Design a protein around this nucleic acid. Sequence first.
RNA 1: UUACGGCGGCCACAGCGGCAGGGAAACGCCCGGUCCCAUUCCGAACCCGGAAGCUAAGCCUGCCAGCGCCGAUGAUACUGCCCCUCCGGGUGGAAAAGUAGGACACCGCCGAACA
RNA 2: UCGCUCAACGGAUAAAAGGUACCCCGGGGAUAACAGGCUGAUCUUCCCCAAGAGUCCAUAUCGACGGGAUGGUUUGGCACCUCGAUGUCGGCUCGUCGCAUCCUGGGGCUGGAGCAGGUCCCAAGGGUUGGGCUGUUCGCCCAUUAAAGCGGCACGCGAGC
RNA 3: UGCCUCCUAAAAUGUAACGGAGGCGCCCAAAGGUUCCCUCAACCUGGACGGCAAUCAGGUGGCGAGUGUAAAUGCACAAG
RNA 4: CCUUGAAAGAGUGCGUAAUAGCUCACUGGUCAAGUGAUUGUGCGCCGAUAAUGUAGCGGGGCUCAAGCACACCGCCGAAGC
RNA 5: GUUGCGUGGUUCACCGCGGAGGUAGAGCUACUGGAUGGCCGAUGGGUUACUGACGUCAGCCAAACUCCGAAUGCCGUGGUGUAAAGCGUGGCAGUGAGACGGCGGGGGAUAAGCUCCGUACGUCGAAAGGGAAACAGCCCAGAUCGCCGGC
Lengths: 95, 59, 134, 71
Amino acid sequence: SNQLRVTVRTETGKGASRRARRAGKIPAVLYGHGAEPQHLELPGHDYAAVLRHSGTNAVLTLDIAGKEQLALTKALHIHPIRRTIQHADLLVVRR
Amino acid sequence: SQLKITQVRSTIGARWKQRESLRTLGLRRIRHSVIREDNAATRGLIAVVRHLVEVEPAQ
Amino acid sequence: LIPRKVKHRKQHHPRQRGIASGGTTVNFGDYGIQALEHAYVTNRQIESARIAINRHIKRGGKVWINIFPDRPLTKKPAETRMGSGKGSPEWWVANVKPGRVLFELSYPNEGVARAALTRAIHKLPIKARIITRE
Amino acid sequence: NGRDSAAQRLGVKRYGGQVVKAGEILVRQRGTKFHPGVNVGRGGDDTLFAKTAGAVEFGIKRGRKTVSIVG
RNA sequence: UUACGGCGGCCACAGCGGCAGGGAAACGCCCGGUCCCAUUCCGAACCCGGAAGCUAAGCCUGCCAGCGCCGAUGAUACUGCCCCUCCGGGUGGAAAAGUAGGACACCGCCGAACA
RNA sequence: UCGCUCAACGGAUAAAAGGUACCCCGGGGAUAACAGGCUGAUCUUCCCCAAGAGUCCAUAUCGACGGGAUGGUUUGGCACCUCGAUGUCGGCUCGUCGCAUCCUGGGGCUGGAGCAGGUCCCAAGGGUUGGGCUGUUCGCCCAUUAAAGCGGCACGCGAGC
RNA sequence: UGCCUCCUAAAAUGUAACGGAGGCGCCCAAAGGUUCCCUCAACCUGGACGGCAAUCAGGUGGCGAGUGUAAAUGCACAAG
RNA sequence: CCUUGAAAGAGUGCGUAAUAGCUCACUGGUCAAGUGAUUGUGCGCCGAUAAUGUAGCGGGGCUCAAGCACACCGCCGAAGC
RNA sequence: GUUGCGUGGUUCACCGCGGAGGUAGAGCUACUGGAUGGCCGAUGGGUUACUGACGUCAGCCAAACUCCGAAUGCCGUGGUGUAAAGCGUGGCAGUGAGACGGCGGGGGAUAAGCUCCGUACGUCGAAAGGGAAACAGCCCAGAUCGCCGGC
Ligand SMILES: [Mg+2]
Ligand SMILES: [Mg+2]
Ligand SMILES: [Mg+2]
Ligand SMILES: [Mg+2]
Ligand SMILES: [Mg+2]
Ligand SMILES: [Mg+2]
Ligand SMILES: [Mg+2]
Ligand SMILES: [Mg+2]
Ligand SMILES: [Mg+2]
Ligand SMILES: [Mg+2]
Ligand SMILES: [Mg+2]
Ligand SMILES: [Mg+2]
Ligand SMILES: [Mg+2]
Ligand SMILES: [Mg+2]
Ligand SMILES: [Mg+2]
Ligand SMILES: [Mg+2]
Ligand SMILES: [Mg+2]
Ligand SMILES: [Mg+2]
Ligand SMILES: [Mg+2]
Ligand SMILES: [Mg+2]
Ligand SMILES: [Mg+2]
Ligand SMILES: [Mg+2]
Ligand SMILES: [Mg+2]
Ligand SMILES: [Mg+2]
Ligand SMILES: [Mg+2]
Ligand SMILES: [Mg+2]
Ligand SMILES: [Mg+2]
Ligand SMILES: [Mg+2]
Ligand SMILES: [Mg+2]
Ligand SMILES: [Mg+2]
Ligand SMILES: [Mg+2]
Ligand SMILES: [Mg+2]
Ligand SMILES: [Mg+2]
Ligand SMILES: [Mg+2]
Ligand SMILES: [Mg+2]
Ligand SMILES: [Mg+2]
Ligand SMILES: [Mg+2]
Ligand SMILES: [Mg+2]
Ligand SMILES: [Mg+2]
Ligand SMILES: [Mg+2]
Ligand SMILES: [Mg+2]
Ligand SMILES: [Mg+2]
Ligand SMILES: [Mg+2]
Ligand SMILES: [Mg+2]
Ligand SMILES: [Mg+2]
Ligand SMILES: [Mg+2]
Ligand SMILES: [Mg+2]
Ligand SMILES: [Mg+2]
Ligand SMILES: [Mg+2]
Ligand SMILES: [Mg+2]
Ligand SMILES: [Mg+2]
Ligand SMILES: [Mg+2]
Ligand SMILES: [Mg+2]
Ligand SMILES: [Mg+2]
Ligand SMILES: [Mg+2]
Ligand SMILES: [Mg+2]
Ligand SMILES: [Mg+2]
Ligand SMILES: [Mg+2]
Ligand SMILES: [Mg+2]
Ligand SMILES: [Mg+2]
Ligand SMILES: [Mg+2]
Ligand SMILES: [Mg+2]
């Protein structure tokens, strides 16, 4: 449906997030009833295309480097001036 | 472990804490080198005065 | 536009720094004017822009002014030396930061709405752009 | 305009962990911004002096910020 | 050790509200105003003397997130010191709000019943 | 323990106001008036947007409400040189420069029939009168003219008047 | 022009201007000391004159009242 | 507001004071590899404008860069070392 | 500041630990004010087509608003480092007109080579040498003397 390939962040911080956003990634977090959050980089342009095509209610079926787990979008941190997505909150869904 | 710290820039225009951290480390003039242990007390001084020195891990 | 009361008649100048953090998205209409730089927007300029929008659309639609000029600015009399007490308030100002949404508009026709907002933008002492509610 | 009164030099004079003598002034204040704990008397103008030697210790006492001295 | 009455710790994750349940001792309402004592009037309250009645209320137990409360991770605002003309960047700290969620408390001593 | 609007409130005496253009001396560019310098609110010259007027027609012409600048000739702000001295308005004589052009020269548009004009662009070679009034600059008036420009230079110029 | 309170004041103290706002040159013989007791304002409903608001009754109300007098810091455990 | 129909406005702007007249909205066929709008950025253009003399690279000169961005290799350079 | 006599690491720097805050930011159905748009609509207005109380749903603002709340700075303490730190007491002073630059503010028009404060900030003053064409206050760097050495 909405396929998206993501990876787990190596380092977390301010400079790390700036580096990711300049390299074209979207730093994001995936929590939920799994009681443990993952820190990820969503691809910038691909995720933006997925989001524009079908809206925010889209069920982002994404796969981690080895495993698969479909997710949902909780909220997006939009920068005011550049009007780009800075951060995305994702919650796990059990079908 | 040990470190070798070399003064690269001058203390003219340096602030009080930077000047005193250099004095505590033991650096006198430009291109002078000292040998110091690698502990938290030493890395604090190096962090304060990093832009004035060159630190390399040599014995 | 003038506030009915102010608790403090003479105030320090509002500080011109930072990106806006509240009111940075279109909330009441479909089209809006977003500020791209700091400035002090006066009630005179606000009324000029509102009149421009209304006379371009001429009918229909709704215009929202989601800023208010409540910060006062003082002025000494003309030919006076420095420093004999602060002057009396003579301007009313809204403190506008980049990202702030100034005016909002709802109108059926895209071209007329955009032209009206450009009319308004040419009255403000700021570089501004037109944004939509996605 | 143009008038003002003198600065009264209020505030905390001895911080947590300091070893005080009996009679040390700990806090100059208006009202009970801090309240007296054990071995701490208040004073006529809300001064929170020390009644015993020991170390100053700040804490919470169900809404009130209190100053105490441990022997 | 269990389960009731007191004295504290702590001061909302403990509070407010809602719905059910209980009376062995105890806590209570309760019955009276001769006695100590009391009402800016009133035995309502405070005090004294009792034991007909009752768990209806207080009190205690269980269940409810309704109102309130707490609340991350990540991101952001801001910022120390550097690089740098600004724009910005590096390195070290890091919110408030919001979200996931938590939560209808916990602990100590004494007495009674049970042991 | 008493006696002080000693309120100029660390309280010169118990006891106290003014003028000086008749003024003098010691100092100061630590501080004003002129000129220079910085600024540019005010002023000046432009411009952006285009509500309208122009019968119709925003943009021949004028352009409200607002916005942005230029210049440094106005009135100012600051007090940076000059107080063991940097002469101050107007006129005269002699000039020199800028162009934001008054005439003459060349053009576009016109709500330019022609003659006349309006507006904008280019252009600084030369020219740009004589009187009445006022100390006047400025201004008004009279008679002409192709025209009777605007400014800078210590508001040019007093060891030139 | 002395004193008191706040902001400027850059989260210790301190900090200037002919900067922004205010008070003081007293009052109380109880408005001091101590012991004991109580909880306000506002809102709702009912009630002769009585009404938006006097007194009464019942609810709700954790501090929005009050504090001799400015402001600030305090005070419901009450400093009311 | 409706209609022949390949297509076919009581009109797109001057233009008629008016009925005129001109163009143009929307299609039929030819030729045949391309054709628009907008978002963000690098470097550029105009706006531009004072009075002794070029006079807003210090000068000569410089785009065959001796300019700008990024990457790299040397060297010069103080009374510093 | 210097100097005599005492004291001797007490000073200062870094690390760790114990502390008080209400600035930046933010937020406001957490207060005092300001304030936009809906809905309900008190009155006032002429059956109410005008005003729009109090509420309520969204979006906001404040040096003298605060349910909140940093980074820094400050106080104490334990380690480590550092000659020409610190403290007491005497002799002898000078100074008490500051200037610019960076960062945070007031006055000013958020003008000034303007003015007034803050800043274990810098430089000049009282600092020569190199760079900035020239050019106290900007960048680099602190001249004991010599050298026809080097980086
Ligand atoms: Mg906000
Ligand atoms: Mg504009
Ligand atoms: Mg004070
Ligand atoms: Mg007293
Ligand atoms: Mg029983
Ligand atoms: Mg009774
Ligand atoms: Mg019961
Ligand atoms: Mg029951
Ligand atoms: Mg966090
Ligand atoms: Mg939070
Ligand atoms: Mg609960
Ligand atoms: Mg005096
Ligand atoms: Mg005096
Ligand atoms: Mg006397
Ligand atoms: Mg003399
Ligand atoms: Mg002169
Ligand atoms: Mg002058
Ligand atoms: Mg001169
Ligand atoms: Mg200018
Ligand atoms: Mg026309
Ligand atoms: Mg135009
Ligand atoms: Mg002077
Ligand atoms: Mg003179
Ligand atoms: Mg001389
Ligand atoms: Mg010309
Ligand atoms: Mg012509
Ligand atoms: Mg004609
Ligand atoms: Mg000429
Ligand atoms: Mg010739
Ligand atoms: Mg001349
Ligand atoms: Mg002259
Ligand atoms: Mg003469
Ligand atoms: Mg003369
Ligand atoms: Mg002469
Ligand atoms: Mg001469
Ligand atoms: Mg303060
Ligand atoms: Mg302070
Ligand atoms: Mg401070
Ligand atoms: Mg007074
Ligand atoms: Mg009393
Ligand atoms: Mg009392
Ligand atoms: Mg030029
Ligand atoms: Mg070399
Ligand atoms: Mg040397
Ligand atoms: Mg802290
Ligand atoms: Mg405060
Ligand atoms: Mg703020
Ligand atoms: Mg509020
Ligand atoms: Mg604040
Ligand atoms: Mg001495
Ligand atoms: Mg003096
Ligand atoms: Mg002085
Ligand atoms: Mg400053
Ligand atoms: Mg200022
Ligand atoms: Mg100055
Ligand atoms: Mg001065
Ligand atoms: Mg400074
Ligand atoms: Mg001197
Ligand atoms: Mg030098
Ligand atoms: Mg020095
Ligand atoms: Mg030099
Ligand atoms: Mg030397």
